[PDB]
Design a binder for this molecule. Structure first.
Ligand SMILES: *[C@H]1O[C@H](CO)[C@@H](O[C@@H]2O[C@H](CO)[C@@H](O[C@@H]3O[C@H](CO[C@H]4O[C@H](CO[C@H]5O[C@H](CO)[C@@H](O)[C@H](O)[C@@H]5O)[C@@H](O)[C@H](O[C@H]5O[C@H](CO)[C@@H](O)[C@H](O)[C@@H]5O)[C@@H]4O)[C@@H](O)[C@H](O[C@H]4O[C@H](CO)[C@@H](O)[C@H](O)[C@@H]4O)[C@@H]3O)[C@H](O)[C@H]2NC(C)=O)[C@H](O)[C@H]1NC(C)=O
Ligand SMILES: *[C@@H]1O[C@H](CO)[C@@H](O[C@@H]2O[C@H](CO)[C@@H](O[C@@H]3O[C@H](CO[C@H]4O[C@H](CO)[C@@H](O)[C@H](O[C@H]5O[C@H](CO)[C@@H](O)[C@H](O)[C@@H]5O)[C@@H]4O)[C@@H](O)[C@H](O[C@H]4O[C@H](CO)[C@@H](O)[C@H](O)[C@@H]4O)[C@@H]3O)[C@H](O)[C@H]2NC(C)=O)[C@H](O)[C@H]1NC(C)=O
Ligand SMILES: *[C@@H]1O[C@H](CO)[C@@H](O[C@@H]2O[C@H](CO)[C@@H](O[C@@H]3O[C@H](CO[C@H]4O[C@H](CO)[C@@H](O)[C@H](O[C@H]5O[C@H](CO)[C@@H](O)[C@H](O)[C@@H]5O)[C@@H]4O)[C@@H](O)[C@H](O[C@H]4O[C@H](CO)[C@@H](O)[C@H](O)[C@@H]4O)[C@@H]3O)[C@H](O)[C@H]2NC(C)=O)[C@H](O)[C@H]1NC(C)=O
Ligand SMILES: *[C@@H]1O[C@H](CO)[C@@H](O[C@@H]2O[C@H](CO)[C@@H](O[C@@H]3O[C@H](CO[C@H]4O[C@H](CO)[C@@H](O)[C@H](O)[C@@H]4O)[C@@H](O)[C@H](O[C@H]4O[C@H](CO)[C@@H](O)[C@H](O)[C@@H]4O)[C@@H]3O)[C@H](O)[C@H]2NC(C)=O)[C@H](O)[C@H]1NC(C)=O
Ligand SMILES: *[C@@H]1O[C@H](CO)[C@@H](O[C@@H]2O[C@H](CO)[C@@H](O[C@@H]3O[C@H](CO)[C@@H](O)[C@H](O[C@H]4O[C@H](CO)[C@@H](O)[C@H](O)[C@@H]4O)[C@@H]3O)[C@H](O)[C@H]2NC(C)=O)[C@H](O)[C@H]1NC(C)=O
Lengths: 330, 543
């Protein structure tokens, strides 16, 4: 059907040259020569080979709404009536004054342009509207974004544990401002990369890698072409915690009893928990840290309708503690 | 800097064309057809050539046996035409009674080469560039692609038509190729040479130089023989036109064309180029935006089409003015005045039939008063005249309003002319000259600007040459930069270089880019003279 799927000139000339389906100026719709009156000798327009500029380009919305001033951001622009070749849209895209270089592979003709923003350090403006010029910045052939792209310089000031075990695996909470900017994010503690989870305006949450040597470590966050640092905010790697004694050396099938556990560096894990493997089932339960040496834990349930512990007593297949990535304690 | 170049290793070159999407350059030659990159690296080479054949033979040896002796002869590319619609290249040769080739666009794969039927034969003529034409298309399923093509005939009146309207099928293997748009036993979409006119004037022939599609028509600039000027051969350069939608061929018109410079006649076309004028020339030539213009090149007199004179003149025609001369001539014959006046076609002069009609520019010819000629020769506006080195070729383009003209020379040189008759100046002035094949290899008519319009591919007998439209970096000083006047050049003040607006970083800002000599950097020092014996003297600088 001549479009029930395309109410934009760019979408029609985009489809098969086979269909014969083409865009008809006057109607503001698209159908064959057959179905559209020739009031002008050039009233029905078809993409001859694609050498057909298309009128009234419009931008619907664009992703990343914010970006770093340094640039490198991949801008993801989605419109309706854009150009039909890449080599016309290339050079057309700009973010206010800032030159934006578009990407070939990621470009979907007259629906979507993926564009890489250049250096915006020299720009006076904090925010600017996005512009596409189809081939020539002609007065009818220009589109301007409905809302504007914002430049920021993200900053960070605090980390929400500042300490963690050498093996790593700590849930880190970096606080700051403008942290959600741009496209890619990479967090590096001691040069070694943090496993990213989620991003926010105010927070970055990631899981720490293993440290080389215990003590203070630099935190480097790079967003696209912007590399932000803070030597006042450091991360302190601690010697791996140890488990020495559990006091009562027992519990019942449903668990839930107090266990007075003793060891070292226990304050360096925020959420430690007990693990126990009974039969083919693995089960876990909570702990409350008091000192660096003392901890109270609630014993794990092993309730299995397949096996019940005997009156004499029985050792589990495995018993240990989940403390970040210190796996020798598992 | 060095000029990017492609050398013809073994043979002469004949035609060049640029693909509007890719910038790939296709090059017709004797025995060869090349595909080249934008910077003129060889991409693919097709052998089309040395074929065992003989010009005297009708249908060539392939179809019928000929008693005439055969020999290995060269196949000259007569024509070359980009068919973007069917992703290919029409590569029309000679030396097989003029059979046409189809090469695939991106690899030169021979898709087809029809040569069974009589229409698949175009002309015996072995001369390069005496042929031209245009490809015109509609969408698939509708009225299909057509080729309008003129060629010389060599006296083979009954074998070939000089001008024709032919069919272009989607299958290259399809036998219907180069068949006439509408054939009847009475009238076919073709125009033949009458036998009576060849008996009277022995070797009359029509040589087609340039050709272009405009709005809804098809024009041709032609050379013909002495028919009211047996004796000797003297040529008359004329314009031809047809409606694109005229299967009957009734729209044919034919006006003589030339121009005069201080009592010196220039009547032989060497090349032409249809273009725009841009805001500048348009305004003071009195035109609308989309109104077209035709730059041309003529040699002096009406002598020796085979080897013309050095004396050559670049003229100008506005198409609105040629359209008015044709409308004026038709609204005249439809008043019943005089005869049709077309010597070579109609030997006995038929008369103009009066009739009441709305004579428009949309008029596509009618049954009576038929194919007709022209009495008043159409005069062109002269621009530049070379007297020591003959012009050979031309192109032009719109740059930021100002109209730049390109002109090949017999020497292998290109001129870069701002046409300034409509501009403030006294007459259109040469800006710059450039070198291609310095030794004296002439430039050929096929001279095309790139798609990005950054370069201009200049073809010779023996080499293609990528000549940049803009090369302002040869200018060392603000004072010389803006002094050359060739309009692409500005002084990028803070970089102290001469180049275009889009090349000077931050040019849009105040005073960062200079375009008139008055914007040039002017500097003065207060203590101009300081003694060797002095040290660390305070100086004040006004800029
Ligand atoms: C960091 O914090 C933690 C606590 O949060 C802390 O660990 C405890 O520290 C406190 C002192 O601050 C100690 O408590 C003292 O115990 C004295 C007597 O010890 C006997 O009783 C112990 C408690 O019995 C309770 O728990 C058991 C088992 O869970 C339970 O059955 C009972 O019902 C009862 O609730 C008992 O654990 C202990 O057994 C220990 O010793 C044996 C043998 O050596 C060993 O094998 C075991 O492993 C076990 O460790 C023993 O039988 C008691 O006198 C004292 O009372 C004084 O202080 C209070 C308050 O200040 C005054 O009011 C009062 O007047 C007394 O002067 C106090 O109750 C406790 O021993 C620690 N726990 C452990 C496991 O060692 C760390 O020390 C803190 N770190 C610091 C301070 O830096
Ligand atoms: C990064 O993280 C590491 C590890 O967590 C930090 O190092 C620790 O610093 C804390 C500070 O809170 C230390 O606790 C204090 O200890 C001092 C005295 O330290 C001495 O005694 C230690 C315990 O007995 C002992 O481990 C130390 O020996 C280490 O160092 C030597 C030499 O380098 C090495 O060879 C050993 O192997 C040890 O590693 C050392 O001799 C003490 O003054 C403090 O007491 C205060 O608090 C108590 C109780 O509240 C109070 O009673 C006192 O009055 C006093 O106010 C406190 O206990 C901890 O010992 C260190 N741990 C380790 C493993 O080194 C490091 O500081 C962090 N870096 C940064 C930049 O912050
Ligand atoms: C070497 O480098 C120095 C740079 O300092 C150049 O010196 C300048 O030369 C030009 C002429 O060559 C001078 O312009 C002329 O100015 C006079 C007015 O002069 C008065 O005002 C001056 C500035 O306000 C001031 O310096 C003068 O005072 C000097 O003289 C006294 C007394 O001798 C001395 O004590 C001081 O130390 C000063 O040196 C003075 O009060 C003006 O009258 C001139 O115009 C006349 O000429 C023109 C052209 O013919 C004509 O059209 C007019 O009608 C008119 O008759 C002229 O403008 C300039 O003042 C000098 N600058 C300084 C700082 O003295 C010098 O040119 C360089 N030498 C060479 C050889 O190139
Ligand atoms: C088995 O039977 C089938 C089907 O019956 C045959 O297939 C047909 O093959 C013939 C060839 O003989 C095809 O005929 C061709 O049709 C073209 C018509 O296209 C036009 O149609 C309309 C109306 O005319 C136009 O409006 C429209 O714009 C199209 O242009 C003709 O143009 C062809 O003519 C050309 O070739 C012939 C022969 O070489 C010349 O005489 C002509 O001058 C001209 O150059 C051609 O006639 C036909 O399309 C096929 N049929 C169908 C239904 O599609 C098989 O031939 C047969 N097979 C065997 C093995 O016996
Ligand atoms: C085929 O033709 C194409 C063009 O038609 C051509 O490829 C182009 O080469 C030019 C340089 O000749 C390149 O332009 C560059 O763009 C980058 C930005 O991505 C700039 O960094 C470059 O600047 C450098 O060069 C300047 C001038 O010399 C220096 O002043 C400066 O310091 C930099 O060193 C430069 O502007 C461009 O990459 C391509 N064009 C495209 C569209 O990719 C090539 O010559 C031909 N190739 C072949 C194989 O024949």
């Amino acid at each position: 059907k001549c479009p029930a799927l395309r109410q934009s000139c760019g979408l029609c000339l985009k489809a098969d040259p086979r269909f014969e389906c083409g865009w008809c100026v006057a109607e503001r719709r698209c159908s064959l020569r057959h179905h559209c009156p020739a009031d002008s000798p050039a009233s029905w327009m078809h993409a001859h080979h694609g050498s057909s500029r298309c009128t009234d380009p419009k931008i619907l919305k664009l992703s990343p709404e914010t970006g770093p001033r340094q640039g490198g951001t991949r801008l993801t622009i989605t419109g309706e009536n854009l150009g039909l070749r890449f080599e016309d849209v290339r050079l057309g895209v700009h973010v206010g004054k800032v030159l934006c270089s578009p990407v070939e592979s990621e470009y979907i003709s007259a629906e979507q342009i993926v564009c890489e923003i250049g250096d915006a350090s020299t720009l006076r403006a904090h925010d600017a509207l996005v512009e596409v010029c189809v081939r020539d910045c002609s007065l009818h052939y220009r589109a301007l974004s409905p809302k504007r792209f914002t430049f920021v310089t993200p900053t960070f000031y605090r980390v929400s544990p500042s300490r963690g075990p050498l093996s790593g695996g700590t849930w880190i909470g970096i606080e700051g401002s403008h942290l959600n900017a741009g496209s890619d994010v990479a967090v590096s503690i001691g040069g070694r990369p943090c496993s990213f989870s989620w991003r926010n305006s105010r927070e970055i949450r990631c899981l720490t890698p293993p440290g080389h040597t215990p003590g203070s470590a630099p935190i480097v966050i790079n967003i696209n072409r912007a590399q932000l640092s803070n030597p006042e905010v450091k991360y302190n790697y601690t010697e791996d915690p140890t488990i020495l004694r559990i006091d009562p050396e027992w519990s019942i099938n449903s668990g839930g009893t107090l266990l007075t556990v003793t060891g070292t560096n226990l304050a360096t894990v925020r959420e430690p928990r007990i693990r126990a493997k009974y039969g083919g089932i693995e089960r876990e339960n909570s702990c409350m840290v008091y000192n660096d040496t003392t901890m109270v834990c609630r014993a794990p349930s092993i309730d299995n309708p397949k096996r019940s512990p005997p009156e004499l007593g029985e050792r589990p297949d495995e018993i240990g503690f989940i403390m970040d990535n210190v796996r020798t304690l598992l | 800097p060095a000029f990017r170049t492609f050398v013809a290793s073994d043979w002469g070159l004949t035609h060049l064309v640029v693909h509007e999407q890719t910038g790939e350059v296709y090059v017709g030659a004797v025995n060869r057809i090349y595909k080249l990159s934008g910077n003129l690296t060889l991409l693919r080479a097709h052998v089309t050539g040395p074929v065992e054949d003989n010009e005297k033979c009708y249908p060539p040896p392939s179809v019928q046996s000929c008693p005439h002796g055969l020999g290995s002869t060269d196949n000259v590319n007569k024509l070359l035409l980009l068919d973007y619609a069917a992703n290919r290249l029409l590569a029309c040769g000679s030396a097989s009674q003029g059979i046409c080739q189809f090469l695939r666009l991106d690899d030169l794969f021979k898709l087809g080469e029809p040569h069974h039927r009589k229409e698949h034969y175009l002309s015996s003529v072995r001369e390069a560039g005496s042929m031209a034409g245009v490809l015109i298309a509609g969408p698939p399923g509708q009225g299909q692609a057509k080729l309008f093509v003129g060629t010389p005939i060599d006296g083979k009146s009954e074998y070939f038509p000089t001008l024709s309207s032919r069919r272009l099928m989607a299958n290259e293997e399809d036998a219907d190729m180069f068949g006439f748009v509408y054939q009847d036993e009475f009238v076919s979409s073709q125009l033949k040479i009458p036998s009576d006119t060849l008996s009277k004037f022995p070797a009359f022939d029509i040589y087609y130089v340039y050709s272009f599609r405009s709005e809804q028509f098809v024009y041709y600039l032609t050379l013909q023989l002495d028919t009211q000027l047996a004796g000797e051969h003297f040529f008359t350069s004329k314009i031809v036109r047809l409606c694109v939608n005229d299967p009957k061929f009734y729209s044919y018109v034919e006006f003589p064309i030339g121009c005069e410079q201080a009592g010196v006649e220039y009547r032989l076309v060497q090349d032409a180029y249809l273009s725009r004028p841009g805001q500048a020339l348009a305004k003071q030539l009195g035109l609308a935006e989309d109104e077209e213009v035709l730059f041309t090149v003529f040699a002096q007199g009406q002598k020796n089409r085979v080897k013309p004179p050095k004396e050559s003149a670049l003229c100008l025609f506005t198409l609105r003015a040629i359209k008015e001369k044709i409308k004026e001539r038709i609204q005249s014959c439809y008043r019943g005045e005089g005869k049709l006046s077309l010597p070579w076609l109609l030997n006995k002069e038929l008369g103009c039939i009066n009739s009441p009609l709305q004579i428009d520019d949309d008029f596509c010819g009618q049954d009576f008063n038929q194919p007709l000629g022209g009495t008043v020769t159409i005069e062109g506006t002269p621009l530049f005249v070379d007297k020591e080195d003959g012009l050979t070729a031309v192109a032009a383009y719109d740059y930021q309003g100002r109209t730049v003209v390109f002109a090949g020379t017999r020497s292998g040189r290109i001129r870069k002319i701002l046409v300034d008759l409509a501009n403030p100046s006294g007459r259109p002035a040469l800006a710059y000259e450039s070198v291609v094949a310095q030794e004296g290899n002439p430039i050929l008519r096929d001279l095309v600007l790139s798609p990005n319009r950054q370069y201009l591919y200049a073809m010779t007998e023996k080499q293609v040459t990528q000549v940049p439209v803009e090369s302002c970096v040869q200018y060392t000083s603000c004072e010389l930069c803006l002094g050359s006047r060739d309009p692409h050049c500005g002084w990028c003040v803070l970089h102290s270089i001469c180049s275009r607006q889009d090349a000077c970083e931050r040019a849009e800002e105040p005073q960062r880019f200079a375009s008139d000599l008055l914007q040039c950097v002017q500097l003065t020092v207060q203590p101009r003279n300081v003694s060797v014996t002095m040290s660390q003297v305070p100086l004040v600088l006004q800029a």
